[PDB]
């Protein structure tokens, strides 16, 4: 896996 | 403010030629001569301007058969189908020149592109 | 001997979405309470274990309207709906807890997996 | 965009 887009 | 899954739209991709793969939900056969080819509709409409303009026809919406035209050749057709639901292009020598001219026919652009850019780099 | 186009996946998916927001070629209604939402079966198939089970049955791959469990959150719903079409999850404070139980019963792994982190740091 | 993969 998850992260900030 | 969302978080976002980097592998999520691949995966989704493997699920769905996974479930062609086992001609689950396949809704429609494409014609290329002699040759059949079975697939998603939505798929097909997702990664082709020509698909995309058969499916959104008032009456071609609900063919359950396309017959494309016979100057198409099935092995470059299989190609874009194998790319549409991979992401991966199978371009060789040989066929480059089916594979770019069906995906002029197919309006698929980017495989246009890079099979112009592999023809060019030979001459 | 393939090549591969980094952004094909993605783009699929964005038009698979853009596809729903039009409502084409949507083939299934899901019923969550007193809340309505179209989706196309290929899609929940591929990103959720409840929904593949569903429709991969012999009676049920047949059915224009599901009714989920009267328990489920519409909301929950509506956010992982989004995520399986975008990969991006609206997680909030407020709704943490019915997205995470709606991915337990979706069968939506590594969303429960997420929720699980996020509530841990919280206590 | 394309790559080898
Ligand atoms: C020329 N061309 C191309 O190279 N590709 C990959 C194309 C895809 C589509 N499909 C769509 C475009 C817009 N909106 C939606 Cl909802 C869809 C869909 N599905 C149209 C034209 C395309
Ligand atoms: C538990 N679980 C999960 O977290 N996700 C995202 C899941 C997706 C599926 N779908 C499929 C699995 C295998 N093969 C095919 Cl062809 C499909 C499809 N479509 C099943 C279980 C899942």
């Given at each position: 896996?998850?992260?900030?887009? | 403010?969302?978080?976002?899954?980097?592998?999520?739209?691949?995966?989704v991709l493997?699920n769905?030629?996974?479930?062609?793969?086992?001609?689950?939900?396949?809704?429609?056969?494409?014609?290329?001569?002699?040759?059949?080819?079975?697939?998603?509709?939505?798929?097909?409409?997702?990664?082709?301007?020509?698909?995309?303009?058969?499916?959104?026809?008032?009456?071609?919406?609900?063919?359950?058969?396309?017959?494309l035209?016979?100057?198409?050749?099935?092995?470059?057709?299989?190609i874009?189908?194998?790319?549409?639901?991979?992401?991966?292009?199978?371009?060789?020598?040989?066929?480059?020149?089916?594979?770019?001219?069906?995906?002029?026919?197919?309006q698929?652009?980017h495989?246009?592109?890079?099979?112009?850019?592999?023809?060019?780099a030979?001459?």
């Open positions: 896996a998850w992260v900030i887009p | 403010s969302c978080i976002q899954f980097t592998r999520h739209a691949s995966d493997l769905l030629n996974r479930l062609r793969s086992r001609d689950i939900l396949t809704d429609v056969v494409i014609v290329v001569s002699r040759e059949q080819f079975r697939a998603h509709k939505t798929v097909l409409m997702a990664c082709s301007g020509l698909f995309y303009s058969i499916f959104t026809d008032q009456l071609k919406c609900n063919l359950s058969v396309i017959n035209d016979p100057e198409i050749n099935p092995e470059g057709f299989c874009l189908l194998d790319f549409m639901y991979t992401s991966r292009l199978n371009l060789r020598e040989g066929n480059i020149m089916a594979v770019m001219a069906t995906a002029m026919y197919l698929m652009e495989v246009v592109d890079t099979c112009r850019k592999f023809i060019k030979s001459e």
